[PDB]
Design an enzyme around this catalytic site. Structure first.
Site, PDB file in Angstrom:
ATOM      1  N   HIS A 178     -55.171  32.189  61.047  1.00  0.00           N
ATOM      2  CA  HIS A 178     -53.981  32.806  61.616  1.00  0.00           C
ATOM      3  C   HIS A 178     -54.278  34.258  62.019  1.00  0.00           C
ATOM      4  CE1 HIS A 178     -51.510  29.578  59.264  1.00  0.00           C
ATOM      5  NE2 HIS A 178     -52.134  29.072  60.309  1.00  0.00           N
ATOM      6  N   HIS A 227     -58.248  21.528  63.272  1.00  0.00           N
ATOM      7  CA  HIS A 227     -59.308  22.472  62.967  1.00  0.00           C
ATOM      8  C   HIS A 227     -60.706  21.880  63.148  1.00  0.00           C
ATOM      9  CE1 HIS A 227     -56.655  25.649  61.759  1.00  0.00           C
ATOM     10  NE2 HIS A 227     -56.080  24.921  60.817  1.00  0.00           N
ATOM     11  N   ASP A 231     -53.227  27.770  65.979  1.00  0.00           N
ATOM     12  CA  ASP A 231     -54.385  27.392  65.179  1.00  0.00           C
ATOM     13  C   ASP A 231     -55.605  27.180  66.114  1.00  0.00           C
ATOM     14  OD1 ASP A 231     -53.237  27.551  62.551  1.00  0.00           O
ATOM     15  OD2 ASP A 231     -52.746  25.476  62.405  1.00  0.00           O
ATOM     16  N   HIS A 256     -47.329  26.120  66.683  1.00  0.00           N
ATOM     17  CA  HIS A 256     -48.259  26.484  65.613  1.00  0.00           C
ATOM     18  C   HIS A 256     -49.654  25.864  65.745  1.00  0.00           C
ATOM     19  CE1 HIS A 256     -49.560  28.291  61.910  1.00  0.00           C
ATOM     20  NE2 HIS A 256     -50.246  27.167  61.733  1.00  0.00           N
TER      21      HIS A 256
HETATM   22  C1  LIG Z   1     -50.366  22.817  59.686  1.00  0.00           C
HETATM   23  C2  LIG Z   1     -51.771  22.543  59.141  1.00  0.00           C
HETATM   24  O1  LIG Z   1     -52.709  22.542  60.221  1.00  0.00           O
HETATM   25  C3  LIG Z   1     -52.152  23.633  58.137  1.00  0.00           C
HETATM   26  C4  LIG Z   1     -53.462  23.255  57.445  1.00  0.00           C
HETATM   27  N1  LIG Z   1     -51.087  23.764  57.130  1.00  0.00           N
HETATM   28  C5  LIG Z   1     -51.309  24.613  56.118  1.00  0.00           C
HETATM   29  O2  LIG Z   1     -52.337  25.275  55.988  1.00  0.00           O
HETATM   30  C6  LIG Z   1     -50.277  24.705  55.191  1.00  0.00           C
HETATM   31  C7  LIG Z   1     -49.994  25.923  54.586  1.00  0.00           C
HETATM   32  C8  LIG Z   1     -48.960  26.015  53.659  1.00  0.00           C
HETATM   33  C9  LIG Z   1     -48.211  24.889  53.339  1.00  0.00           C
HETATM   34  C10 LIG Z   1     -47.186  25.105  52.423  1.00  0.00           C
HETATM   35  C11 LIG Z   1     -46.199  25.284  51.521  1.00  0.00           C
HETATM   36  C12 LIG Z   1     -45.209  25.362  50.625  1.00  0.00           C
HETATM   37  C13 LIG Z   1     -44.287  25.340  49.814  1.00  0.00           C
HETATM   38  C14 LIG Z   1     -43.236  25.334  48.874  1.00  0.00           C
HETATM   39  C15 LIG Z   1     -41.918  25.422  49.308  1.00  0.00           C
HETATM   40  C16 LIG Z   1     -40.887  25.515  48.382  1.00  0.00           C
HETATM   41  C17 LIG Z   1     -41.172  25.517  47.021  1.00  0.00           C
HETATM   42  N2  LIG Z   1     -40.184  25.606  46.135  1.00  0.00           N
HETATM   43  C18 LIG Z   1     -42.490  25.430  46.586  1.00  0.00           C
HETATM   44  C19 LIG Z   1     -43.522  25.337  47.514  1.00  0.00           C
HETATM   45  C20 LIG Z   1     -48.495  23.671  53.945  1.00  0.00           C
HETATM   46  C21 LIG Z   1     -49.528  23.578  54.871  1.00  0.00           C
HETATM   47  C22 LIG Z   1     -52.326  24.965  58.870  1.00  0.00           C
HETATM   48  O3  LIG Z   1     -51.399  25.767  58.956  1.00  0.00           O
HETATM   49  N3  LIG Z   1     -53.544  25.167  59.391  1.00  0.00           N
HETATM   50  O4  LIG Z   1     -53.760  26.425  60.100  1.00  0.00           O
HETATM   51 ZN   LIG Z   2     -52.062  27.156  60.806  1.00  0.00          ZN
END
Ligand SMILES: C[C@@H](O)[C@](C)(NC(=O)c1ccc(C#CC#Cc2ccc(N)cc2)cc1)C(=O)N=O
Ligand SMILES: [Zn+2]
Ligand SMILES: C#Cc1ccc(C(=O)N[C@H](C(=O)N=O)[C@@H](C)O)cc1
Length: 302
Positions: free
Chosen positions: A79, A265, A242, A238
Protein backbone atom coordinates in the site's frame (compact mmCIF):
# COMPACT_ATOMS: atom_id res chain seq x y z
CA UNK A 1 15.74 17.00 -17.88
CA UNK A 2 13.15 14.88 -16.11
CA UNK A 3 14.76 14.24 -12.80
CA UNK A 4 14.63 11.58 -10.12
CA UNK A 5 12.85 12.66 -6.95
CA UNK A 6 13.33 12.03 -3.26
CA UNK A 7 11.95 13.61 -0.06
CA UNK A 8 12.88 17.10 1.19
CA UNK A 9 12.74 16.13 4.84
CA UNK A 10 12.51 13.22 7.25
CA UNK A 11 8.95 12.49 8.43
CA UNK A 12 7.44 9.99 10.85
CA UNK A 13 4.08 8.44 11.75
CA UNK A 14 2.84 5.71 14.04
CA UNK A 15 0.16 3.08 13.61
CA UNK A 16 -0.75 -0.49 14.40
CA UNK A 17 0.83 -3.53 12.75
CA UNK A 18 -1.82 -5.72 11.11
CA UNK A 19 -0.03 -8.89 12.30
CA UNK A 20 1.32 -8.01 15.72
CA UNK A 21 -1.39 -5.57 16.80
CA UNK A 22 1.43 -3.44 18.20
CA UNK A 23 2.34 0.20 17.74
CA UNK A 24 4.74 0.64 14.83
CA UNK A 25 6.76 3.77 14.18
CA UNK A 26 7.30 4.53 10.51
CA UNK A 27 10.14 6.90 9.41
CA UNK A 28 10.61 8.11 5.80
CA UNK A 29 14.00 9.53 4.76
CA UNK A 30 15.45 11.29 1.68
CA UNK A 31 18.00 9.30 -0.34
CA UNK A 32 20.58 9.97 -3.08
CA UNK A 33 20.14 9.44 -6.81
CA UNK A 34 19.96 5.85 -8.11
CA UNK A 35 19.67 4.22 -4.68
CA UNK A 36 16.01 3.38 -5.26
CA UNK A 37 13.41 2.39 -2.67
CA UNK A 38 14.79 0.66 0.42
CA UNK A 39 12.70 -0.81 3.22
CA UNK A 40 14.57 -1.14 6.47
CA UNK A 41 13.87 -2.92 9.77
CA UNK A 42 15.34 -1.12 12.77
CA UNK A 43 13.89 -3.51 15.36
CA UNK A 44 16.66 -6.00 14.50
CA UNK A 45 20.21 -5.18 15.55
CA UNK A 46 21.97 -4.60 13.30
CA UNK A 47 19.23 -3.09 11.07
CA UNK A 48 18.28 -5.06 7.95
CA UNK A 49 17.76 -3.44 4.54
CA UNK A 50 15.37 -4.76 1.88
CA UNK A 51 15.82 -3.05 -1.52
CA UNK A 52 12.53 -3.11 -3.46
CA UNK A 53 13.10 -5.79 -6.11
CA UNK A 54 10.64 -7.99 -8.04
CA UNK A 55 12.66 -11.12 -7.18
CA UNK A 56 12.56 -10.48 -3.46
CA UNK A 57 8.79 -10.47 -3.24
CA UNK A 58 6.81 -13.17 -1.48
CA UNK A 59 2.98 -13.26 -1.42
CA UNK A 60 1.95 -14.22 2.09
CA UNK A 61 -1.52 -15.13 3.40
CA UNK A 62 -2.05 -11.48 4.29
CA UNK A 63 -0.63 -8.72 2.13
CA UNK A 64 2.92 -9.09 0.71
CA UNK A 65 6.45 -9.35 2.13
CA UNK A 66 10.04 -8.63 0.96
CA UNK A 67 12.79 -11.11 1.92
CA UNK A 68 16.58 -11.02 2.25
CA UNK A 69 19.22 -13.73 1.71
CA UNK A 70 18.42 -15.36 5.06
CA UNK A 71 14.61 -15.23 4.74
CA UNK A 72 14.13 -12.46 7.27
CA UNK A 73 11.06 -10.49 6.17
CA UNK A 74 9.31 -7.17 6.16
CA UNK A 75 5.57 -7.33 5.48
CA UNK A 76 2.69 -5.13 4.29
CA UNK A 77 4.74 -2.95 1.97
CA UNK A 78 2.43 -2.73 -1.02
CA UNK A 79 0.00 0.00 0.00
CA UNK A 80 2.85 2.38 0.87
CA UNK A 81 4.60 1.28 -2.33
CA UNK A 82 1.51 2.27 -4.30
CA UNK A 83 1.66 5.77 -2.77
CA UNK A 84 5.36 6.02 -3.76
CA UNK A 85 4.33 5.29 -7.36
CA UNK A 86 1.35 7.67 -7.12
CA UNK A 87 3.49 10.59 -5.94
CA UNK A 88 6.44 9.76 -8.16
CA UNK A 89 9.03 9.11 -5.46
CA UNK A 90 12.13 7.32 -6.89
CA UNK A 91 14.66 7.23 -4.05
CA UNK A 92 13.69 6.80 -0.43
CA UNK A 93 14.56 4.98 2.77
CA UNK A 94 11.55 3.65 4.67
CA UNK A 95 12.23 2.45 8.22
CA UNK A 96 10.05 0.63 10.69
CA UNK A 97 10.89 -0.51 14.18
CA UNK A 98 8.84 -3.66 13.60
CA UNK A 99 8.49 -6.52 11.14
CA UNK A 100 5.77 -4.77 9.13
CA UNK A 101 4.59 -1.44 7.74
CA UNK A 102 1.59 -0.10 9.75
CA UNK A 103 -1.78 -0.97 8.10
CA UNK A 104 -3.33 2.46 8.78
CA UNK A 105 -6.93 2.59 7.54
CA UNK A 106 -6.26 -0.18 4.97
CA UNK A 107 -5.73 2.24 2.05
CA UNK A 108 -2.85 4.33 0.67
CA UNK A 109 -4.34 7.72 1.58
CA UNK A 110 -2.63 8.22 4.97
CA UNK A 111 0.72 7.63 3.24
CA UNK A 112 -0.18 10.29 0.68
CA UNK A 113 -0.48 12.96 3.35
CA UNK A 114 2.69 11.71 5.02
CA UNK A 115 4.68 11.97 1.77
CA UNK A 116 3.28 15.45 1.14
CA UNK A 117 4.55 16.54 4.58
CA UNK A 118 8.04 15.35 3.56
CA UNK A 119 8.13 17.41 0.34
CA UNK A 120 9.90 16.73 -2.95
CA UNK A 121 13.54 17.19 -3.82
CA UNK A 122 14.64 16.83 -7.43
CA UNK A 123 18.05 15.21 -7.94
CA UNK A 124 20.31 15.94 -10.91
CA UNK A 125 20.11 12.51 -12.56
CA UNK A 126 17.71 11.30 -15.22
CA UNK A 127 14.64 9.37 -14.18
CA UNK A 128 14.60 6.00 -15.97
CA UNK A 129 11.31 4.54 -17.22
CA UNK A 130 10.66 0.99 -18.32
CA UNK A 131 9.07 1.11 -21.78
CA UNK A 132 7.19 -1.99 -22.96
CA UNK A 133 8.11 -3.14 -26.50
CA UNK A 134 6.82 -6.71 -26.91
CA UNK A 135 3.56 -7.99 -25.50
CA UNK A 136 4.09 -10.13 -22.42
CA UNK A 137 1.47 -12.31 -20.81
CA UNK A 138 1.40 -14.63 -17.84
CA UNK A 139 -1.36 -16.88 -16.63
CA UNK A 140 -2.50 -19.05 -13.76
CA UNK A 141 -5.32 -21.25 -15.01
CA UNK A 142 -8.35 -19.01 -15.48
CA UNK A 143 -6.35 -15.98 -14.37
CA UNK A 144 -4.03 -13.89 -16.51
CA UNK A 145 -2.08 -10.65 -16.63
CA UNK A 146 -0.42 -8.87 -19.51
CA UNK A 147 1.50 -5.82 -20.56
CA UNK A 148 1.25 -4.26 -23.99
CA UNK A 149 3.05 -1.38 -25.73
CA UNK A 150 1.31 1.95 -25.21
CA UNK A 151 2.66 5.47 -24.95
CA UNK A 152 1.25 5.91 -21.48
CA UNK A 153 0.29 3.88 -18.43
CA UNK A 154 -3.18 2.39 -18.38
CA UNK A 155 -4.64 -0.29 -16.08
CA UNK A 156 -7.66 -2.48 -16.80
CA UNK A 157 -8.67 -4.66 -13.91
CA UNK A 158 -11.34 -7.28 -13.72
CA UNK A 159 -12.15 -9.06 -10.49
CA UNK A 160 -14.67 -11.83 -10.33
CA UNK A 161 -16.62 -11.72 -7.20
CA UNK A 162 -19.63 -13.68 -6.38
CA UNK A 163 -20.26 -12.10 -3.13
CA UNK A 164 -23.64 -10.63 -2.58
CA UNK A 165 -22.12 -7.36 -1.53
CA UNK A 166 -20.34 -6.91 -4.81
CA UNK A 167 -22.68 -6.16 -7.67
CA UNK A 168 -22.09 -6.90 -11.35
CA UNK A 169 -21.60 -3.27 -12.38
CA UNK A 170 -18.69 -3.05 -9.92
CA UNK A 171 -16.23 -5.73 -10.98
CA UNK A 172 -14.16 -3.85 -13.45
CA UNK A 173 -12.20 -0.67 -13.19
CA UNK A 174 -10.13 1.07 -15.85
CA UNK A 175 -8.02 4.18 -15.55
CA UNK A 176 -5.30 6.15 -17.22
CA UNK A 177 -2.72 6.62 -14.55
CA UNK A 178 -1.69 9.99 -13.24
CA UNK A 179 -0.72 11.28 -9.84
CA UNK A 180 -3.98 13.22 -9.56
CA UNK A 181 -6.09 10.27 -10.65
CA UNK A 182 -4.33 7.95 -8.21
CA UNK A 183 -4.83 10.30 -5.30
CA UNK A 184 -8.50 10.99 -6.12
CA UNK A 185 -9.86 7.70 -7.48
CA UNK A 186 -7.64 5.05 -5.90
CA UNK A 187 -5.69 6.12 -2.80
CA UNK A 188 -8.67 5.93 -0.38
CA UNK A 189 -9.88 2.47 -1.46
CA UNK A 190 -9.46 0.07 1.45
CA UNK A 191 -8.34 -3.52 1.71
CA UNK A 192 -11.02 -6.03 2.54
CA UNK A 193 -11.50 -9.38 4.15
CA UNK A 194 -13.94 -12.06 5.23
CA UNK A 195 -14.95 -11.92 8.91
CA UNK A 196 -14.86 -15.65 9.63
CA UNK A 197 -11.33 -15.88 8.21
CA UNK A 198 -10.16 -12.91 10.29
CA UNK A 199 -11.85 -14.46 13.34
CA UNK A 200 -9.99 -17.68 12.72
CA UNK A 201 -6.61 -16.03 12.18
CA UNK A 202 -7.00 -14.15 15.45
CA UNK A 203 -7.86 -17.33 17.35
CA UNK A 204 -4.36 -18.47 16.44
CA UNK A 205 -2.75 -15.18 17.47
CA UNK A 206 -2.56 -13.84 13.90
CA UNK A 207 -3.91 -10.70 12.24
CA UNK A 208 -4.02 -9.18 15.74
CA UNK A 209 -4.21 -5.61 14.40
CA UNK A 210 -7.29 -6.30 12.31
CA UNK A 211 -10.27 -4.06 13.02
CA UNK A 212 -13.08 -2.29 11.16
CA UNK A 213 -10.77 0.72 11.25
CA UNK A 214 -8.26 -0.96 8.94
CA UNK A 215 -10.40 -2.93 6.47
CA UNK A 216 -13.75 -3.47 4.86
CA UNK A 217 -15.08 -6.62 6.56
CA UNK A 218 -17.91 -8.70 5.07
CA UNK A 219 -19.67 -11.79 6.34
CA UNK A 220 -21.40 -14.17 3.91
CA UNK A 221 -24.03 -11.57 3.07
CA UNK A 222 -22.97 -7.95 3.54
CA UNK A 223 -20.44 -5.31 4.50
CA UNK A 224 -20.26 -5.05 8.31
CA UNK A 225 -18.56 -1.64 8.60
CA UNK A 226 -21.30 0.72 9.89
CA UNK A 227 -20.41 3.51 7.45
CA UNK A 228 -20.38 1.10 4.49
CA UNK A 229 -18.25 1.71 1.41
CA UNK A 230 -16.31 4.79 0.30
CA UNK A 231 -17.07 3.93 -3.35
CA UNK A 232 -19.61 1.51 -4.82
CA UNK A 233 -16.75 -0.32 -6.48
CA UNK A 234 -14.27 0.09 -3.60
CA UNK A 235 -13.18 -3.59 -3.81
CA UNK A 236 -11.87 -3.40 -7.37
CA UNK A 237 -10.39 0.06 -6.85
CA UNK A 238 -8.39 -1.51 -4.01
CA UNK A 239 -7.18 -4.32 -6.29
CA UNK A 240 -6.00 -1.58 -8.66
CA UNK A 241 -4.16 0.11 -5.81
CA UNK A 242 -2.51 -3.25 -5.03
CA UNK A 243 -1.50 -3.71 -8.72
CA UNK A 244 0.20 -0.28 -8.80
CA UNK A 245 2.12 -1.22 -5.66
CA UNK A 246 3.01 -4.65 -7.13
CA UNK A 247 4.32 -3.15 -10.38
CA UNK A 248 6.32 -0.41 -8.66
CA UNK A 249 8.37 -3.15 -6.97
CA UNK A 250 10.86 -2.82 -9.86
CA UNK A 251 11.47 0.75 -8.71
CA UNK A 252 10.52 2.31 -12.03
CA UNK A 253 7.39 3.69 -13.64
CA UNK A 254 6.38 1.52 -16.57
CA UNK A 255 5.20 2.88 -19.90
CA UNK A 256 2.68 0.38 -21.24
CA UNK A 257 -0.86 -1.04 -21.04
CA UNK A 258 -1.67 -3.24 -18.07
CA UNK A 259 -4.58 -5.62 -18.25
CA UNK A 260 -5.52 -8.36 -15.80
CA UNK A 261 -8.35 -10.82 -15.15
CA UNK A 262 -8.65 -12.13 -11.59
CA UNK A 263 -5.02 -11.23 -10.96
CA UNK A 264 -3.51 -10.51 -7.58
CA UNK A 265 -0.16 -10.11 -5.89
CA UNK A 266 1.35 -13.39 -7.07
CA UNK A 267 0.33 -13.02 -10.70
CA UNK A 268 1.19 -9.32 -11.03
CA UNK A 269 4.65 -10.00 -9.69
CA UNK A 270 4.90 -12.99 -12.02
CA UNK A 271 4.15 -10.61 -14.89
CA UNK A 272 6.71 -8.08 -13.63
CA UNK A 273 9.46 -10.72 -13.56
CA UNK A 274 8.45 -12.18 -16.92
CA UNK A 275 8.68 -8.75 -18.54
CA UNK A 276 12.04 -7.95 -16.96
CA UNK A 277 13.61 -11.34 -17.80
CA UNK A 278 12.69 -11.07 -21.48
CA UNK A 279 15.38 -8.61 -22.55
CA UNK A 280 13.84 -7.72 -25.90
CA UNK A 281 10.43 -7.11 -24.40
CA UNK A 282 11.47 -3.87 -22.68
CA UNK A 283 13.92 -0.95 -22.58
CA UNK A 284 14.89 1.93 -20.29
CA UNK A 285 14.01 5.39 -21.58
CA UNK A 286 14.66 8.89 -20.28
CA UNK A 287 13.25 12.30 -21.13
CA UNK A 288 15.61 15.17 -21.86
CA UNK A 289 12.89 17.60 -22.80
CA UNK A 290 10.01 17.43 -20.38
CA UNK A 291 7.59 17.80 -23.30
CA UNK A 292 8.27 14.18 -24.24
CA UNK A 293 6.92 13.06 -20.86
CA UNK A 294 3.64 11.21 -21.39
CA UNK A 295 0.82 12.81 -19.41
CA UNK A 296 0.51 9.79 -17.08
CA UNK A 297 3.75 10.62 -15.30
CA UNK A 298 3.43 14.36 -14.85
CA UNK A 299 4.23 15.78 -11.40
CA UNK A 300 1.24 15.87 -9.00
CA UNK A 301 -0.60 19.20 -8.69
CA UNK A 302 -0.53 19.00 -4.88
C1 LIG B 1 -7.53 -7.73 -0.33
C2 LIG B 1 -6.35 -8.71 -0.31
O1 LIG B 1 -5.65 -8.64 -1.55
C3 LIG B 1 -5.41 -8.35 0.84
C4 LIG B 1 -4.34 -9.44 0.99
N1 LIG B 1 -6.17 -8.23 2.09
C5 LIG B 1 -5.48 -8.01 3.21
O2 LIG B 1 -4.25 -7.90 3.25
C6 LIG B 1 -6.24 -7.91 4.37
C7 LIG B 1 -5.87 -7.03 5.37
C8 LIG B 1 -6.63 -6.93 6.53
C9 LIG B 1 -7.77 -7.71 6.68
C10 LIG B 1 -8.47 -7.51 7.86
C11 LIG B 1 -9.16 -7.34 9.01
C12 LIG B 1 -9.90 -7.26 10.12
C13 LIG B 1 -10.63 -7.25 11.11
C14 LIG B 1 -11.46 -7.23 12.25
C15 LIG B 1 -12.63 -6.48 12.25
C16 LIG B 1 -13.39 -6.38 13.40
C17 LIG B 1 -12.99 -7.03 14.57
N2 LIG B 1 -13.72 -6.93 15.67
C18 LIG B 1 -11.81 -7.77 14.57
C19 LIG B 1 -11.05 -7.88 13.41
C20 LIG B 1 -8.14 -8.60 5.67
C21 LIG B 1 -7.38 -8.70 4.52
C22 LIG B 1 -4.73 -7.01 0.53
O3 LIG B 1 -5.19 -5.95 0.96
N3 LIG B 1 -3.62 -7.10 -0.21
O4 LIG B 1 -2.93 -5.85 -0.53
ZN1 LIG C 1 -4.18 -4.31 -0.48
C1 LIG D 1 -6.30 -19.22 7.47
C2 LIG D 1 -7.36 -19.30 6.36
C3 LIG D 1 -7.04 -18.96 5.02
C4 LIG D 1 -8.01 -19.04 4.00
C5 LIG D 1 -9.29 -19.44 4.31
C6 LIG D 1 -10.43 -19.60 3.28
O1 LIG D 1 -10.24 -19.67 2.07
N1 LIG D 1 -11.74 -19.69 3.83
C7 LIG D 1 -13.00 -19.94 3.11
C8 LIG D 1 -13.68 -18.72 2.50
O2 LIG D 1 -14.66 -18.83 1.75
N2 LIG D 1 -13.16 -17.42 2.75
O3 LIG D 1 -13.77 -16.42 2.17
C9 LIG D 1 -13.66 -20.58 4.27
C10 LIG D 1 -14.91 -19.89 4.72
O4 LIG D 1 -13.75 -21.94 4.17
C11 LIG D 1 -9.61 -19.79 5.65
C12 LIG D 1 -8.64 -19.72 6.67
Amino acid sequence: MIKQRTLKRIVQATGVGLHTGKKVTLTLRPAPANTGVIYRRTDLNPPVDFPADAKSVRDTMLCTCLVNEHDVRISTVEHLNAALAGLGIDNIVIEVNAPEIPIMDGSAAPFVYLLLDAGIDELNCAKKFVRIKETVRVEDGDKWAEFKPYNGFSLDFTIDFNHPAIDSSNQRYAMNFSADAFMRQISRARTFGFMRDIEYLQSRGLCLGGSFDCAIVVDDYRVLNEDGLRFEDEFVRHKMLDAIGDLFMCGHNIIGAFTAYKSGHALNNKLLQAVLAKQEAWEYVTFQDDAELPLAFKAPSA
